[PDB]
Symmetry: D2
Subunit: 213 residues, 4 copies
């Protein structure tokens, strides 16, 4: 937990938190059913959301309360959340709960049976100009192709500071992160060994989408 | 006394305070705030390894060895627990992490902590959203090893012994 | 006795089957409980009232309905708080009151403890929530203090019922209505419902 | 409380009507809008799944052996993106065993026709029930697009869940598919200049995201 620097000075932060570890140990077990995999994934997403939303600026708000008037606080950056589909959709339906005020955009990638190159059909996103913080929500950061391709259109609209949330990433994937966007930050629950013949992360979680749907 | 100044916390606390907010949003911004308290207060927690196998290959995870006995204090700290079970699924529950939105005077809490360590309760953690100096004063008066996690420290209580500014009556704003 | 309503719905039966299996982890036990509750709520809230109310859409003026008299929820603890935090969702407008009870491992009696409510007056519908209505002592104790304040119509939502428990119900109150997922065989040596689910409390806490 | 037309079933339930009223209100926060949506989704599921738990289950309780039931043939859920995803993380709650498929389309500004795109779909042949989830069945284009590719893969009986439908959308349904079943909480008068349903709720997506 620091986490590491890597090649393009890609900054990674490893959520080593105990309840993080426990949810993670639930997510990888092959004994666990898709329900418990969805629920484990969800509660694990707020952990990442919390570790990433630390240095998020704020803003005072004039407020009442019961028994007289007082002043509170309210975050000031409106985080665009971006689920990478298919897999990053369990993560979003209560990042909302963590971040109610935050808006959602849709871009993603899907992999070929053999070549493994990302397929790109979709474009339903905001007017994502400059000063807009963007968290990308993808569980398995594997080769990077899927990740690299979303950020490819993020930065095309001039996406500012980028954070990426993921349960597990691989040294291949983070490397293709540095090559793509040197000033994006990455939050994982674990770094792994690497990929395999089928570019699945190992040990990892299996196919993250399949065991939610 | 550990004050969770995290922005999501300060936000959620801002919402609990507000008079405009419905009990439901009150109940929603409380449960969600209780998670942050859990996350800060469990960050030095002892663990334990677990041999498991993934669908692909075999490895070793971490249990957390000694999960806590939650204790919610009635009537107020039960809108906390039905989401604290989400954070800690293996936590057992009693009626130690003590769960109570307003530590005001401290009697309700210390009366609980008196029967906690009666039986032999080691390290205790307390979780509230708001505390009064009076209540914290009562605390170490009773157990001076306990730790306390709160979203803010307020001025103190008033004539009726409510925390000011505070949120009102935390029980009344959920039930 | 009477009046029982068995929720024999497809999803309801699957959730009960999960709740009964001993193989199921208590996280899955609370989740299947949680889910199985709304089904009971949905059935018990079919002959509820409505207003209608004037509201405005982003596009036109219209009228909807709400509930005129949303019920006072009364979870029976220790067991019945896995039930209530999702009933909340189904009925946002419902208020909550609390009492708890504890049946012994010898005397067979519940040591009731709780008196945390909204004082009585109406003409207030009440939905008492507790998963196992076995002996009836826990239930009957609660209903005594509900109708002590003058409780009108009482609904009881539970997971499983025993004939002995239902027998005590119309011993205490013959006008309450009961919604169960199943009526079982009865109790045992230890005043547990057989086949049942075991202890409903222990399997969430 | 259900109801019928003449395929269409209007869920006139007290909680459904209470939850519906909340979805239209403009005063409600989008969080409460999605919270109100979440509950009203299950109500529709419960009314629409009055059927099929035709498997008994041998199980054993902590106090002796007994037999229960589960559901045979659990439906493939198909939320229409981006709107009907506030619905599906809790349909999951209703139907734990249900697998999920994705197939979204938006509506264009002017023009009219939905620019379609989306093929994240399981291995579907014949005897597989489908419950499509989308809050607003307006023009019918978004829906029929989905159903066009569902029944390309030989989809059997199809159910559609929505919060409100317009007469124009249901018109579009039975010309695309005359055997599909529809479940809404209310039937409104219709669409407007820009093809929003009036009274409706405004835009169901924007009111969650």
């Amino acid at each position: 937990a620091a986490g590491v620097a890597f090649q393009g000075a890609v900054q990674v932060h490893v959520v080593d938190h105990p309840l993080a570890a426990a949810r993670l140990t639930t997510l990888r077990d092959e004994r666990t059913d898709n329900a418990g995999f969805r629920a484990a994934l969800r509660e694990l997403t707020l952990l990442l959301i919390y570790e990433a939303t630390r240095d998020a600026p704020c803003e005072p708000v004039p407020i009442r309360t019961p028994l007289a008037e007082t002043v509170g606080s309210r975050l000031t950056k409106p985080p665009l959340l971006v689920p990478v589909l298919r897999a990053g959709l369990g993560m979003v339906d209560e990042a909302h709960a963590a971040l109610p005020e935050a808006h959602v955009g849709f871009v993603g990638v899907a992999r070929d049976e053999q070549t493994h190159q990302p397929v790109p059909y979709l474009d339903s996103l905001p007017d994502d100009l400059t000063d807009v913080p963007v968290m990308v929500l993808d569980p398995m950061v594997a080769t990077g192709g899927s990740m690299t391709h979303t950020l490819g259109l993020l930065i095309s609209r001039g996406a500012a500071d980028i954070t990426v949330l993921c349960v597990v990433a691989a040294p291949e994937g983070i490397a293709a992160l540095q090559k793509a966007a040197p000033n994006v930050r990455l939050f994982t629950a674990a770094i792994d060994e690497g990929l395999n013949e089928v570019a699945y992360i190992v040990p990892g979680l299996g196919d993250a989408g399949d065991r939610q749907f």
